[PDB]
Amino acid sequence: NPDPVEESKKHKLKRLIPTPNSYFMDVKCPGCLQITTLFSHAQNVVLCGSCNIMLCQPTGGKCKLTEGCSFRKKIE
Amino acid sequence: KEESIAKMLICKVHIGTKNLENKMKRYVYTRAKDGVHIINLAKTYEKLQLAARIIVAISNPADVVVVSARPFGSRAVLKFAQYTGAQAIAGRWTPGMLTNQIIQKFTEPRLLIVTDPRTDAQSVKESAYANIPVIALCDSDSPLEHVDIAIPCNNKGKESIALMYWLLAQEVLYLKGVIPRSEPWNVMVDMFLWR
Amino acid sequence: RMYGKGKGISSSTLPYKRKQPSWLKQKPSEIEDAIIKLAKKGQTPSQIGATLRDNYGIPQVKSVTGNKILRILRAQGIATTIPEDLYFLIKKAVSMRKHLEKNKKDKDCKFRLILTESKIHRISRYYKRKKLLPSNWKYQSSTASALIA
Amino acid sequence: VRMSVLADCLKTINNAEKRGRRQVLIRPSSKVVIKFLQYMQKKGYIGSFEIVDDHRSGKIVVNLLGRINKCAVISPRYDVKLDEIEKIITSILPSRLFGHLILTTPYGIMDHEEARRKHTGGKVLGFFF
Amino acid sequence: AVQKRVLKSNPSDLEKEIAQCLLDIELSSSSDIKTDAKEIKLLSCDLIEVEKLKKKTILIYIPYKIYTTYVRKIQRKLINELEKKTKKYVVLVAKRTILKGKQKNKSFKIIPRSRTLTSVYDSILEDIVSPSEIIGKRISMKADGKRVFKIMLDSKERQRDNIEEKLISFAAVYKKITRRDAVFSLPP
Amino acid sequence: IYIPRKCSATSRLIPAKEHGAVQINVGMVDANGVYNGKTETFAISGHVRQNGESDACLNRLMYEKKLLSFQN
RNA sequence: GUGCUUCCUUCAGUACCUUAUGAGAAAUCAAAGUCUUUGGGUUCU
RNA sequence: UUCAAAGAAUCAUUCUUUUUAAAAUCCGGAUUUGUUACUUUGAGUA
Ligand SMILES: [Mg+2]
Ligand SMILES: [Mg+2]
Ligand SMILES: [Mg+2]
């Protein structure tokens, strides 16, 4: 049944209805005290608000994301 | 039934071999960390039941041949033949058997029950030239060319094969009037098994 | 691929929902302002978009602002005379030519230079057909270097 | 590259039929293609089909009844006059008793018989058996 | 005193009632929002019934500008309030005009694609569900020469008493607007 | 006027000299499990058998009836 | 498993194997297939 | 880039009627709206 498919989001970016694999991230450093916002698969580095520190290490797909840290997905 | 499943487990039909065969994928539950492929087992049961039903649907039992060229399924198939009506072949299948009219050992059935379409492939092939349906107690890796029903099991492990055969026989008996339900069937596995 | 034998399909593909997502707080005006600032700072359209995506929380300027980013630049009046892609191509060509001048025996480079020239001429033609380029605009191997600025 | 979406779609359908599929994912939907599919459905050859709207050229997936022998485009959409039809149909489709030769006609797309009934011939899209 | 002014018609049965309700809400400041009916107006309404045991539901045709500015922003609150007040299910839509392509308006030169029929229909679909937001349109051509639009909405609405009923109402309203069958759903 | 047989899976319809193609017959149950007199029938064309999709087709057919329950 | 390594899926290369109610004059060919059920586009011969 | 919808006849199908927007025109009713290809009717041909 090509129409109502179930577990195949492990297809390529070219599914039945194309989605992106990327998503946005509510992110926080250990002790900057804020939602910083982020895009997974971000090319250019993002500097957090206060002390401008590397939050995302840039890379060939899905930014490495610095130190321990924590990220919620933005959802919706 | 859980009992059947338990029996299967005790034997080994849950393990299929390495090499998956894309058309068999659906029957396989998942692969293991080892490098083996575990068959879904409920599927094996249901399929087996279906096969049994089909067998029963044949009017007279004698014209439903069974086959295994393997040395250690041969015994099992003989037993099956004895218990139901069905011919066994056992061992050396002759290439003319279902086509060549004039041959001595001709005998053209209404169903063919192979144990393994890998090794007993000739028989399977023949089934095409005489419109014989073919059920197959096939492995994970096996080719399902010409086989109608594929019961997913394992063929490598002789004991497992024997068990499967026994189960099938039991099912057929149940379907027929001979051994009523609720009562377990008297004869054992080990009886079917090679040595 | 237009010129190689390359046949890859690596691509951005946007999400089904094209009315902006709930979590996006930025009002349009602010984002427009930001875009303008970026443009002023020397960034090109694509680059600007990338910056917006990464540094600020915003996926697509098209979902927040009805308009696409080039359009808004145009509206604000900070649009380049010479379109992004075309400009880039020209730059590349210039670079190639310099190399050739330096280093005469490079055959592969020359071949690639020809290809880039051809592509420019296509792109250039297309722009002429619209009204982004003026009709009086050939691309010249002599001038080229001065053009980019 | 693509040129005639419709042709490609028809080819895909044919392939599916040959294999004996059931479902088949016609990959760029087109108004024309949709119309063609509808026509086919009307004359029984195809089942349901769920034109899925992306936010682009849509995909159709189409439900097959194991009934089509072939379906096809005839590229160069030759203008075809009403008198010129008969010869064309003789050339193409396997019997006068069946098969359908689909024209785009200023009264929408319709089969050769329909065209005849109307009066207008037009440009010839394709056919099935 | 006002009330007739909040609508843009000659008062008729239900529009007037709706206006009154709005005024009351403005006066009272129910639930959370206040002075939001100062901003709102309406053009017209239509009561429609469904294939039910009972229930009638309401289109509220809103001038487009107003919809764009205020109603879009605060829709959930408004609709819920209306439901609480008048047990009839309500939907806001923008009265947006459709134009034939080949036709020549005094305005424009070339119709904008905003005003095209298809686009308008899409927009009204978007409008009518508004607690939720569409996941995927998908148009089943039945073999009978019918077309069914099988729309599926996101989560969110799954936490409500009115789900299936609401969906049915939406479908009905769509039918009324655009003589189109439709079916609605959600994911498990 | 011999009207030929339609493969119950793919509807391809199968001629005299096909062989290969098979009319598999499934016997019914009556409450106990005992063999009911009746028999539900599927013809399967040669092409599907050759492919190996035959088993899948059979499964689908069963699902369409009530005979077995998993589809795939 | 010990940042790398493997395994899964997937892209783009790139070969090979079996299989063709697919093709072919055959040799063979996952393209040489979807071709008297002949028309996706196009250049050359 | 206006998709569609509903009613009557016939042996699931065929042929017919009606309306679903916007602008100009006419005494709430009634009636015009890109160019060419293509196609249909004609006209005119010893
Ligand atoms: Mg080229
Ligand atoms: Mg490509
Ligand atoms: Mg040819």
Q: Does D30 touch chain E (CB under 8 A)?
A: no
Chain F contact probe: residue of B56, B118, B147, B185 with most F CBs at under 10 A: B56
Nearest CA to the C1' of G18 belongs to which residue? B143
> Tokens representing C149?
């600025």
DSSP class of F18: G
Torsion sign (Cα): B7, B10, B14, B17: negative
Tokens representing residue F55 in the block: 């088993």
Contact C89, C82 (CB under 8 A): no
Q: Which nucleotides of G are covered by protein (CB under 7 A)?
A: 3, 8-13, 20-22, 33-35, 37-41
Dist CA A56 CA C3 (whole Å): 35
**C1' of nucleotide H6: residue with nearest CA:** E179
Task: Tell me the CA–centroid distance for residue D76 and ligand 3, in Å.
Answer: 14
Q: Which ligand is nearest to the CA of C115?
A: 1
* Residue-by-residue DSSP string for E118-139: HHHHHHHHHHH--SS-EEE-EE
- Tell me the chain F residues in contact with residue B46 when contact means C-beta distances shorter than 8 Å: 68-70
Minimal-distance CA residue of chain C relative to A74 = C23
Inter-chain CB proximity D38 and E145 less than 8 Å: yes
Chain F partners within 8 Å of D69 (Cβ): none
Distance from CA of D117 to the nearest CA of A (A): 38
- From the candidates C12, C13, C44, C60, which should be mutated to test the interface with A, based on the most A CB atoms within 10 A? C13
Residue of chain C nearest A13, judged by CA positions: C13
Do the Cβ atoms of B88 and B75 come closer than 8 Å?
Answer: no
Is C18 in contact with D54 (Cβ distance < 8 A)? no
In chain A, residues with a C-beta closer than 8 Å to the C-beta of E136 are 17
User: Measured CA to C1', what is the nucleotide nearest E115?
Assistant: H1
**Least CB–CB distance from C57: residue in A18, A37, A75:** A37
Q: Which CATH number fits domain F1-72: 3.30.1230.20, 1.10.3720.10, 3.50.50.60, 3.40.50.300?
A: 3.30.1230.20
CATH number for D1-68: choose from 3.30.1370.30, 3.30.565.10, 3.40.50.300, 3.30.2090.10.
3.30.1370.30
Chain A residues whose C-beta is within 8 A of a chain D C-beta are: 1-3, 16-18
Residues C18 and C63: beta-carbon distance below 8 Å: yes
How do E182-185 and E147-153 pair as beta strands? Answer: parallel
Contacting partners of chain B (3+ CB pairs under 8 A): F
For residues E104 and E125, give the distance between their C-alpha atoms in angstroms, rounded to a whole number.
Answer: 27
Q: How far apart are CA D127 and CA E101, in angstroms?
A: 31
Chain D closest-CA separation from residue F12 CA (Å): 6
What positions of strand H are covered by protein, i.e. any atom < 7 Å from a CB?
A: 1-5, 12-15, 21-24, 33-34, 38-41
Chain B residues whose CB is inside 8 A of the F39 CB are: 57
Across the strands, what pairs with F27?
A: F39
- For an interface test with A, the pick among E133, E138, E140, E151 (most A C-beta atoms closer than 10 Å) comes out as E138
User: Residue E138: which of D37, D47, D50 has the nearest Cβ?
Assistant: D50
Q: What is the 3-state secondary structure (H, E, C) of chain B?
A: CHHHHHHHHHCCCCEECCCCCHHHHHHEEEECCCCCEEECCHHHHHHHHHHHHHHHHCCCHHHEEEECCCCCCHHHHHHHHHHCCCCECCCCCCCCCCCCCCCCCCCCCCEEEECCCCCCHHHHHHHHHCCCCCEECCCCCCCCCCCCEECCCCCCCHHHHHHHHHHHHHHHHHHCCCCCCCCCCCCCCCCCCCC
The amino acid sitting at B10 is I
Is the CB of residue E75 less than 8 Å from the CB of residue E90? no
What does the H/E/C string look like for chain D? Answer: CCCCHHHHHHHHHHHHHHHCCCEEEECCCCHHHHHHHHHHHHCCCEEEEEEECCCCCCEEEEEECCCCCCEEECCCCCECCCCCHHHHHHHHCCCCCCCEEEEEEECEEEEHHHHHHHCCCCEEEEEEC
Q: Of B83, B65, B180, B48, nearest to F35 (Cα)?
A: B180
Using alpha carbons, list the distances in angstroms from residue D108 to A72, C56, D116. 54, 51, 14
**Are E178 and E149 in contact, with CB atoms under 8 Å apart?**
no
Neighbours of A49 (CB within 10 A): 12
CA–CA gap between residue B145 and residue B117 (Å, rounded): 8
Residue E84 corresponds to which amino acid?
K
Q: Are E94 and E62 contacting, i.e. CB atoms less than 8 angstroms apart? A: yes
- Give the Å distances, CA to CA, from E82 to C12, D114, E85: 43, 53, 5
Backbone region of residue F11 per phi and psi (left: phi > 0; alpha: psi in -120 to 50; beta: other values): left
Distance E94 CA to H11 C1' (A): 47
Do F48 and D20 make contact, defined as CB atoms within 8 angstroms?
yes
Partner-chain contact C13 A75, CB within 8 Å: no
The experimental method, as deposited, was: cryo-EM
Q: Which residues contact F6 (CB under 8 A, 6 or more apart)?
A: F12, F13, F14, F43
Distance, in Å, from the CA atom of B155 to the CA atom of C113, rounded to the nearest integer, reads: 64
Contact status, residue B116 vs residue B155, Cβ threshold 8 Å: yes
CA distance C92 to C113: 9
Are C35 and C61 in contact by the 8 Å Cβ rule? The answer is: yes
Q: Which residues of F touch B (CB under 8 A)?
A: 18-29, 32-35, 39, 44, 46, 49-56, 58, 62, 67-70, 72
B107 and B128 Cβ atoms separated by less than 8 Å:
no
Continuous segment of H or E residues that includes residue E60: strand E56-63
**CA E162, E58, E95 angle in degrees (round to 5)?**
125
Integer-rounded Cα radius of gyration of chain E:
17
- What domains are defined for chain C? 25-79 (no CATH), 80-149 (1.10.287.10)
Neighbours of chain D (3+ CB pairs under 8 A): A, C, E, F
A44:C16 CB<8 A: no
C-alpha distances (whole Å) from E78 to each of B71, C135, E19, E72, E85 are 80, 56, 13, 10, 11
Q: Of the candidates A54, A52, A49, A58, which has an alpha carbon nearest to the alpha carbon of residue A69?
A: A54
Q: Do chains D and F touch (3 or more CB pairs under 8 A)?
A: yes
3-state helix, strand, coil in chain A (%, to 5): 0, 15, 85
Name the residue among E137, E139, E134 with its Cα closest to residue E155: E134
**Chain position carrying tokens 């058997």:** B97
Taking the C-alpha atoms of residue E5 and residue F69, their distance in angstroms, rounded to an integer, is 64
Residue B109 has which token pair?
């059935």
**Crossing angle of helices B2-10 and B158-175, rounded to 10°:** 160
Nearest to A44 among C22, C51, C59 (CB): C51
Strand D46-52 relative to strand D60-64, pairing: antiparallel
3-state secondary structure (DSSP) of residue C117: helix
Strands D23-26, E182-185: pairing is: unpaired
**Which token pair is C42?**
């020397």
CA-nearest of B64, B63, B28 to B152 is: B28
Interface of D with A (CB under 8 A): 23-25, 50, 52, 54, 56, 59, 61
Distance CA A48, CA A34 (A): 9
**Neighbouring residues of E44: CB distance < 8 A, sequence distance ≥ 6:** E7, E8, E9, E15, E61, E95
DSSP 8-state secondary structure symbol assigned to residue C90: H
Distance CA C42, CA C33 (A): 15
CATH number of A1-76: 2.20.25.100
Sign of dihedral through CA atoms E116, E117, E118, E120? positive
CA angle B184, B186, B192 (to 5 degrees): 115
Tokens standing for residue E123: 């927009």
Q: Which amino acid is at A49?
A: G
* Domain B4-195 of CATH type 3.40.50.10490: yes
Residue of E40, E56, E55 lying closest to E5 (CA atoms): E40
How many domains are contained in chain E?
1
Secondary structure of residue A20 in the 3-state scheme: coil
**Chains A and C are touching, with contact defined as 3 or more CB–CB pairs separated by less than 8 Å:** yes
Q: Which of C67, C28, C64 is nearest to C45 (CA)?
A: C67
- Architecture per CATH, domain D69-129, reads as 2-Layer Sandwich (3.30)
Residues 6+ apart with CB under 8 A from C67: C61, C75
Give the closest residue to B143 by CA, choosing from B159, B155, B157: B155
Of E170, E165, E130, E132, nearest in space to E150 by CA: E170
- What distance in Å separates the CA atoms of residue C58 and residue C49, rounded to the nearest whole number? 9
D24 Cβ partners below 8 Å, 6+ apart?
Answer: A2, D12, D13, D16, D61, D62, D64
Long-range contacts of C12-16 (CB under 8 A, 24+ apart): C12/A20, C13/A13, C13/A14, C13/A18, C13/A19, C13/A20, C14/A20, C14/C60, C14/D55, C15/A19, C15/A20, C15/C59, C16/A17, C16/A18, C16/A19, C16/D54, C16/D55, C16/E135, C16/E136
Retrieve residue E50's tokens.
């469904």
- DSSP label of F17: G
CA of A2 from ligand 2 middle (Å) equals: 22
Instruction: Round to whole Å and give the CA distance between C115 and C123.
Output: 12
Smallest CA–CA separation between E105 and chain C, in Å? 24
Neighbours of F29 (CB within 10 A): 16
Q: Which value, in Å, is the radius of gyration of the alpha carbons in chain D?
A: 14
Domain of residue E134: give its range.
1-188
The CB-side HSE value for B55 (13 A sphere, CA atoms) comes to 33
| Residue C21 DSSP class | P
Task: Please report how the helices C107-129 and C84-102 are oriented relative to each other, as an axis angle in degrees rounded to 10.
Answer: 150
Q: In the structure encoding, which two tokens stand for residue D52, read together?
A: 């899925």
